[PDB]
Design an enzyme around this catalytic site. Structure first.
Site, PDB file in Angstrom:
ATOM      1  N   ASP D  94      10.002  -8.217  -2.634  1.00 11.72           N
ATOM      2  CA  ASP D  94       9.710  -7.330  -1.652  1.00 11.72           C
ATOM      3  C   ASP D  94      10.731  -7.085  -0.466  1.00 11.72           C
ATOM      4  O   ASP D  94      11.406  -6.034  -0.259  1.00 11.72           O
ATOM      5  CB  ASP D  94       8.365  -7.978  -0.681  1.00 11.72           C
ATOM      6  CG  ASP D  94       7.648  -6.669   0.023  1.00 11.72           C
ATOM      7  OD1 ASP D  94       6.637  -5.888  -0.493  1.00 11.72           O
ATOM      8  OD2 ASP D  94       7.945  -6.543   1.329  1.00 11.72           O
ATOM      9  N   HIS D  95      11.194  -8.475   0.061  1.00 15.58           N
ATOM     10  CA  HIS D  95      12.378  -8.519   1.085  1.00 15.58           C
ATOM     11  C   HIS D  95      13.335  -7.911   0.658  1.00 15.58           C
ATOM     12  O   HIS D  95      14.555  -7.795   1.344  1.00 15.58           O
ATOM     13  CB  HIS D  95      12.543 -10.063   1.701  1.00 15.58           C
ATOM     14  CG  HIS D  95      11.460 -10.454   2.322  1.00 15.58           C
ATOM     15  ND1 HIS D  95      11.366 -11.507   3.061  1.00 15.58           N
ATOM     16  CD2 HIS D  95      10.118  -9.783   2.611  1.00 15.58           C
ATOM     17  CE1 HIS D  95      10.015 -11.489   3.729  1.00 15.58           C
ATOM     18  NE2 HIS D  95       9.384 -10.440   3.610  1.00 15.58           N
ATOM     19  N   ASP D  96      13.685  -7.740  -0.701  1.00 17.25           N
ATOM     20  CA  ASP D  96      15.221  -7.343  -1.339  1.00 17.25           C
ATOM     21  C   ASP D  96      15.068  -5.707  -1.147  1.00 17.25           C
ATOM     22  O   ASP D  96      16.155  -5.196  -1.131  1.00 17.25           O
ATOM     23  CB  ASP D  96      15.021  -7.724  -2.920  1.00 17.25           C
ATOM     24  CG  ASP D  96      16.220  -7.615  -3.316  1.00 17.25           C
ATOM     25  OD1 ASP D  96      16.767  -6.323  -2.999  1.00 17.25           O
ATOM     26  OD2 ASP D  96      16.758  -8.614  -3.974  1.00 17.25           O
TER      27      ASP D  96
HETATM   28  C1  HEM Z   1       2.883 -13.336  -0.429  1.00 15.82           C
HETATM   29  C2  HEM Z   1       3.294 -12.245  -0.729  1.00 15.82           C
HETATM   30  C3  HEM Z   1       3.669 -11.236   0.129  1.00 15.82           C
HETATM   31  C4  HEM Z   1       3.889 -10.036  -0.281  1.00 15.82           C
HETATM   32  C5  HEM Z   1       4.095  -9.208  -1.681  1.00 15.82           C
HETATM   33  C6  HEM Z   1       4.004  -9.227   1.079  1.00 15.82           C
HETATM   34  C7  HEM Z   1       4.453  -7.956   1.108  1.00 15.82           C
HETATM   35  C8  HEM Z   1       4.675  -7.351   2.715  1.00 15.82           C
HETATM   36  C9  HEM Z   1       5.634  -6.091   2.815  1.00 15.82           C
HETATM   37  C10 HEM Z   1       5.969  -5.114   1.804  1.00 15.82           C
HETATM   38  C11 HEM Z   1       5.421  -5.884   3.942  1.00 15.82           C
HETATM   39  C12 HEM Z   1       5.910  -4.731   4.702  1.00 15.82           C
HETATM   40  C13 HEM Z   1       7.405  -4.566   4.545  1.00 15.82           C
HETATM   41  C14 HEM Z   1       8.164  -3.759   5.628  1.00 15.82           C
HETATM   42  O1  HEM Z   1       8.177  -2.628   5.803  1.00 15.82           O
HETATM   43  O2  HEM Z   1       8.440  -4.564   6.634  1.00 15.82           O
HETATM   44  C15 HEM Z   1       4.588  -6.846   4.677  1.00 15.82           C
HETATM   45  C16 HEM Z   1       4.351  -7.277   6.187  1.00 15.82           C
HETATM   46  C17 HEM Z   1       3.901  -8.241   6.764  1.00 15.82           C
HETATM   47  N1  HEM Z   1       4.009  -9.444   6.141  1.00 15.82           N
HETATM   48 FE1  HEM Z   1       4.147  -9.794   4.254  1.00 15.82          FE
HETATM   49  N2  HEM Z   1       3.931 -10.223   2.099  1.00 15.82           N
HETATM   50  C18 HEM Z   1       3.669 -11.228   1.695  1.00 15.82           C
HETATM   51  C19 HEM Z   1       3.496 -12.440   2.336  1.00 15.82           C
HETATM   52  C20 HEM Z   1       3.246 -12.714   3.601  1.00 15.82           C
HETATM   53  C21 HEM Z   1       2.938 -13.862   4.402  1.00 15.82           C
HETATM   54  C22 HEM Z   1       2.895 -15.250   3.784  1.00 15.82           C
HETATM   55  C23 HEM Z   1       2.865 -13.531   5.806  1.00 15.82           C
HETATM   56  C24 HEM Z   1       2.237 -14.662   6.706  1.00 15.82           C
HETATM   57  C25 HEM Z   1       2.794 -15.551   7.008  1.00 15.82           C
HETATM   58  C26 HEM Z   1       3.094 -11.998   5.867  1.00 15.82           C
HETATM   59  C27 HEM Z   1       3.121 -11.455   6.813  1.00 15.82           C
HETATM   60  C28 HEM Z   1       3.451 -10.389   7.381  1.00 15.82           C
HETATM   61  C29 HEM Z   1       3.778  -9.852   8.391  1.00 15.82           C
HETATM   62  C30 HEM Z   1       3.444 -10.212   9.830  1.00 15.82           C
HETATM   63  C31 HEM Z   1       3.855  -8.307   8.246  1.00 15.82           C
HETATM   64  C32 HEM Z   1       4.010  -7.233   9.281  1.00 15.82           C
HETATM   65  C33 HEM Z   1       2.748  -6.522   9.276  1.00 15.82           C
HETATM   66  C34 HEM Z   1       2.660  -5.029   9.804  1.00 15.82           C
HETATM   67  O3  HEM Z   1       3.938  -4.959  10.424  1.00 15.82           O
HETATM   68  O4  HEM Z   1       2.264  -4.024   9.356  1.00 15.82           O
HETATM   69  N3  HEM Z   1       3.354 -11.723   4.578  1.00 15.82           N
HETATM   70  N4  HEM Z   1       4.546  -7.943   3.575  1.00 15.82           N
HETATM   71 CA   LIG Z   2      17.759  -4.962  -2.180  1.00 14.10          CA
END
Ligand code: HEM
Ligand SMILES: [Ca+2]
Ligand code: HEM
Ligand SMILES: *[C@@H]1O[C@H](CO)[C@@H](O[C@@H]2O[C@H](CO)[C@@H](O)[C@H](O)[C@H]2NC(C)=O)[C@H](O)[C@H]1NC(C)=O
Ligand SMILES: *[C@@H]1O[C@H](CO)[C@@H](O[C@@H]2O[C@H](CO)[C@@H](O)[C@H](O)[C@H]2NC(C)=O)[C@H](O)[C@H]1NC(C)=O
Ligand SMILES: *[C@@H]1O[C@H](CO)[C@@H](O[C@@H]2O[C@H](CO)[C@@H](O)[C@H](O)[C@H]2NC(C)=O)[C@H](O)[C@H]1NC(C)=O
Ligand SMILES: *[C@@H]1O[C@H](CO)[C@@H](O[C@@H]2O[C@H](CO)[C@@H](O)[C@H](O)[C@H]2NC(C)=O)[C@H](O)[C@H]1NC(C)=O
Ligand SMILES: *[C@@H]1O[C@H](CO)[C@@H](O[C@@H]2O[C@H](CO)[C@@H](O)[C@H](O)[C@H]2NC(C)=O)[C@H](O)[C@H]1NC(C)=O
Ligand SMILES: *[C@H]1O[C@H](CO)[C@@H](O[C@@H]2O[C@H](CO)[C@@H](O)[C@H](O)[C@H]2NC(C)=O)[C@H](O)[C@H]1NC(C)=O
Ligand SMILES: [Ca+2]
Lengths: 104, 462, 462, 104
Positions: D94-96
């Protein structure tokens, strides 16, 4: 966006009860294929020189207009199957669908 | 300033000339070009898109308007008589003329220093281009002041907004119905139409009703339909005598021509009796508009088809193989492949030297130079490209007469009896008209009929 | 300050609260939420769109960077060795550790106020969210140090950049090739796979490699897989008793744990041998992120699910039906139509209490709550949606490992037989990794193997 | 864009030759469907109160999580066929691919 329109809007604000802005006036164009600029975001392909479109030097428009467009006005060819009112609805149509501005 | 100047600088993007111009013999000159206004000034990540001032709907904008300060200003607001405001003082034969615009740089005034005929105010900012274009605006201005009237005769207590609003519906309806029935199928083909205009099942809230940036260039295919002069005929349909054929050049922005030189009729009809031009690869577009575009009002006269390709670079559109590909058609990547496609070795070898790769030829070019489609008059590129936009204005418009809540069944019934010829009959002084499918009958001993051999409306049903 | 105020103004768009919240017992409270920066500051005529700070392509951005400044900021240039920059103040055991971002507001300093651990410096701005994410950025980091050091052994006379760039390609492949060979099939589904991702063929000049604003939401299907603890296992692959299972609430941003708590392996060893939580319609997201998202650092603790639903809104994505439509998938109109689609008479029933009509469900909910794909871990919407983006990412991309001009036939052969466990054996200090499809294996004794029964990369062709 | 590349660019720029800007850095997001705002151009539904989406009021996020998502953290079912690294590749991947800036 209102309830039971008996009539239309004018600016077209709300045909799309979902994306109200859609089809509207003074909103920008749609693009069914990415835009191709010379920098990639805002400079006419024939802008800077020696800049090739895609391995070829951007041809001048006055010159294309000259080499393939030119013709002896004397050899015109009447479309015997359609009348001008046909070429004049084209406009009445264009004129209802699009228009892009320039700045004075 | 880009009219009087040649620097490559901002508002401007000029057209350099070549070595061997016919008209323009000096390599330090240019036909002018102000580029198109961006949707986001001051952007550095936004990919450049241009704006559209109008409405994509087949609402009848050019008559009614698409901005609402404008709009209010076209109705007459004294009475409660719902009505398009007319020329305070300069009329036809007791038939309405368009109002006058109030403009700081009235081109249509530069045509005859002597006469005061300014640009006509109306729906579109550019209805003064050809006296043959203003004339239609009049005709539509007409049916409006007319329907409004008669409806006033079928429903009294009905106010202004409502007598106008109802009337407005009836109109955009005429223009829709007539463009989907008697114009498109001749400007696209039979087939294209079966591939692009299937019938109208219903409205789809998920159809993108807006105008594609490209259509913007594809619709100018019609530039190849235009004829060197302006023909105006007398009630007998021959050679009409203030002066018959006026070259397309003394007509640009010619309001006086309408007011002073002899009604809307003489043109509205004769437009009706003169074969449209015919496009072929040896007669793309002409000098009357290749070398004289707006020249009695400009410093040098534009080259139409040239602003076209240049307007295309402006928009930032892709070339002819992308759309060739976007539409499901083949993409010739060779002069050899090229002839195979536009059946013309000669133009293929031509196009190919202009452009190196068929992939970099301007849509206009590619577009207009494809062989016409059978029974139609557009290439497989343009048919696709024109056929699909039209397919969506219809299906993505909640106000398409055939939608099932706009006009009643009952209403619709007579509503599909409306034919332009009658429009150009009820509203003008003309007797004898051209038959059904106005667009397809140039001829005139017959290729015409009388004004009784044509149905009318049934506001009854209102 | 939208991390502190609760006023619905500007930058902010706060998560207000229901009067009957388990956690938040004050209606005047909220959950701190800012709004995604627009592509064009100054709403006028352009519909707002958000921006992608990172690159679409599957490049190893998270490792190297996304922009020029940071990229050159992440390297050893006090050498020609072509290496990534690594911590000069702490070591794994002997192995590297990431450098430290220099922030004026370090949040990883908040976990332990009695330990100087700022947060790691990486390709991505969020390497520290979780100590295991970091474990990976620390692993791939090791490979472009390992490889450059090894590429210097074979091609000695190679420059410093060459030595680094070339290393870059070896890793971009390690990531691409796993995602596509060992990750998609499994998130994806044996059936959806043969549709969204047929086998490679060539490279489409015309394939929008761009990442769509929805996937931005549809790819969050992952939140449903998290486990409320951080598991550390020794290398008897047993509960690493510094302290083996820590609530995920008191790890957010805690680099200290990584640096002082035992190293990078005890973590990597938990990701491998402890099951992933499985999504059920009864068990969507675990509370450690529904009510404890970031507290050891922030004001009040956030609700991921909820935070997901509002970006939904801030990034004007349409709802669960447009999507459905958008994917030749039927669109439930009723609780039955729904109960049926979802295969839930309850959930559907519940979703409708919240939303009026399915037409209106925020994607994330409809996405994570449709039944799991046969052998998948996603339902058709997400499935379709998610695979439809990894497809373009493959055909779009000019530097896809399998594209003609990139990696010669041998290089390819070589590359083809890398594996993530071997990467894990090469740069970590563990000896018994998981057997094939680590994404799948997870039991000790068995559904694992030793690190010698594992192939190796062969740089003989480079 | 070059006249010819061994390695990728970092900001991902000349990848595609026709549109140098495609799938690049600090560039706009793509749209597969027109945006759905309340304004029509720029205001999250779930913004003004009393505003409805299609005909219904708009749920509250903390509200539906409370309802559809809250589950007894101890009833957890362990996915016996997938491993926790499966979730990590998820985050990393995702981060990539994407990131969407806020305004600190
Ligand atoms: C484990 C697999 C995970 C996937 C596939 C995933 C995927 C995503 C994606 C694609 C985004 C939005 C990307 C962006 O535009 O910035 C997001 C947002 C977020 N994720 Fe993850 N995530 C995962 C795990 C986690 C974990 C471990 C945490 C908490 C410890 C988390 C915390 C957050 C937060 C704080 C946001 C921002 C929420 C928002 O602004 O709407 N993520 N994640
Ligand atoms: Ca990339
Ligand atoms: C007859 C059918 C015609 C069609 C279908 C047509 C179509 C088009 C279209 C689509 C555009 C751009 C629309 C916009 O952006 O607002 C254009 C531009 C233009 N047209 Fe036509 N047009 C027609 C007739 C004419 C005629 C007869 C003239 C002059 C006598 C004319 C003069 C121009 C000029 C000066 C431009 C601006 C050039 C540029 O910068 O792009 N048009 N027309
Ligand atoms: C507004 O409507 C009136 C009504 O037709 C227009 O013209 C006047 O019509 C009445 C009939 O009720 C005549 O008796 C007047 O003589 C007409 N006006 C003039 C100037 O003589 C009027 O022109 C319309 N407004 C505009 C701006 O056209
Ligand atoms: C310019 O426009 C005028 C507007 O009336 C045209 O008018 C002619 O003017 C002459 C003398 O002033 C009259 O004898 C004619 O009768 C007018 N035309 C008609 C049809 O009656 C004029 O012809 C135009 N052209 C020029 C070059 O002045
Ligand atoms: C590259 O991808 C495009 C899009 O995935 C393919 O072109 C599409 O083809 C269909 C089929 O007729 C058209 O309806 C679409 O309009 C096309 N899209 C575009 C953007 O042109 C194209 O065929 C693929 N090219 C190859 C060689 O595989
Ligand atoms: C840059 O590379 C050097 C060399 O690998 C890194 O480590 C030091 O290298 C020198 C000479 O090669 C040795 O004598 C030192 O012993 C090495 N480190 C230590 C702590 O002893 C150096 O750390 C790299 N730069 C960064 C920012 O890590
Ligand atoms: C309304 O039109 C849309 C677009 O023309 C149709 O939607 C597409 O349907 C196909 C299936 O053939 C999907 O694979 C596309 O993803 C859809 N796109 C969109 C924007 O909807 C839709 O089916 C039409 N609706 C009806 C009831 O006919
Ligand atoms: C923050 O870090 C310090 C130092 O690592 C932690 O305290 C350590 O606790 C371990 C285990 O009980 C001892 O082995 C260390 O000697 C302690 N450090 C010191 C300086 O004495 C501290 O516990 C961490 N924060 C928390 C809340 O545990
Ligand atoms: Ca219109």
């Amino acid at each position: 966006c209102p309830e039971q329109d008996k009539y239309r809007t004018i600016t077209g604000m709300c045909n799309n009860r979902r994306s109200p802005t859609l089809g509207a006036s003074n909103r920008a164009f749609v693009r069914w294929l990415p835009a191709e600029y010379e920098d990639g975001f805002s400079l006419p392909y024939g802008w800077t020189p020696g800049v090739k479109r895609n391995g070829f030097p951007v041809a001048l428009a006055r010159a294309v207009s000259n080499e393939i467009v030119r013709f002896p006005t004397d050899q015109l060819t009447p479309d015997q199957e359609r009348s001008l009112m046909f070429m004049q609805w084209g406009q009445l149509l264009d004129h209802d669908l699009d228009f892009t501005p320039e700045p004075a | 300033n880009c009219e009087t100047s040649c620097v490559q600088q901002p508002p401007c993007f000029p057209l350099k000339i070549p070595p061997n111009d016919p008209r323009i013999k000096n390599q330090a000159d240019c036909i002018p070009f102000f580029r198109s206004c961006p949707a986001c000034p001051g952007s550095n990540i936004t990919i450049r898109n241009q704006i559209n001032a109008l409405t994509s709907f087949v609402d009848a904008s050019m008559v009614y308007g698409s901005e609402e300060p404008l709009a209010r200003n076209l109705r007459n607001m004294s009475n409660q008589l719902g009505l398009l405001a007319v020329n305070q003082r300069f009329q036809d034969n007791g038939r309405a003329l368009l109002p006058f615009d109030n403009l700081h740089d009235d081109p249509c005034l530069l045509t005859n220093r002597s006469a005061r005929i300014p640009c006509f105010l109306a729906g579109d900012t550019r209805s003064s281009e050809m006296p043959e274009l203003t004339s239609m605006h009049t005709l539509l201005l007409r049916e409006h002041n007319r329907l409004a009237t008669e409806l006033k005769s079928l429903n009294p207590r009905w106010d202004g907004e409502r007598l106008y609003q109802e009337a407005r519906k009836i109109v955009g309806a005429m223009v829709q119905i007539i463009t989907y029935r008697d114009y498109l199928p001749l400007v696209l083909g039979p087939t294209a139409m079966r591939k692009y205009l299937p019938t109208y099942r219903s409205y789809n809230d998920s159809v993108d009703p807006r105008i594609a940036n490209v259509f913007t260039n594809a619709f100018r295919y019609g530039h190849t339909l235009i004829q060197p002069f302006m023909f105006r005929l007398d009630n007998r349909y021959q050679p009409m005598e203030p002066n018959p054929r006026v070259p397309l050049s003394r007509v640009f922005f010619a309001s006086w021509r309408v007011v002073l030189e002899g009604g809307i009729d003489p043109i509205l009809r004769g437009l009706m009796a003169t074969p449209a031009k015919l496009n072929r690869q040896n007669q793309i577009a002409v000098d009357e508009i290749r070398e004289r575009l707006f020249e009695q009002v400009m410093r040098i006269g534009l080259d139409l088809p040239a602003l076209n390709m240049q307007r295309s670079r402006d928009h930032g559109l892709p070339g002819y193989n992308a759309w060739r590909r976007f539409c499901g058609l083949p993409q010739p990547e060779t002069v050899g492949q090229l002839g195979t496609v536009l059946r013309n070795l000669k133009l293929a070898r031509k196009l190919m030297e202009q452009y190196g790769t068929p992939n970099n030829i301007d849509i206009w070019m590619g577009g207009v130079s494809e062989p016409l489609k059978r029974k139609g008059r557009v290439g497989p590129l343009l048919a696709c490209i024109i056929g699909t936009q039209f397919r969506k204005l219809r299906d993505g418009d909640r106000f398409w007469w055939e939608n099932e809540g706009v006009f009643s069944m009952q209403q619709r019934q007579a509503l599909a009896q409306i034919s332009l010829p009658r429009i150009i009959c009820d509203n003008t002084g003309i007797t004898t008209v051209s038959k059904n499918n106005i667009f397809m009958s140039n001829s005139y001993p017959r290729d015409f009929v009388n004004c009784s051999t044509l149905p009318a409306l049934n506001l009854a049903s209102w």
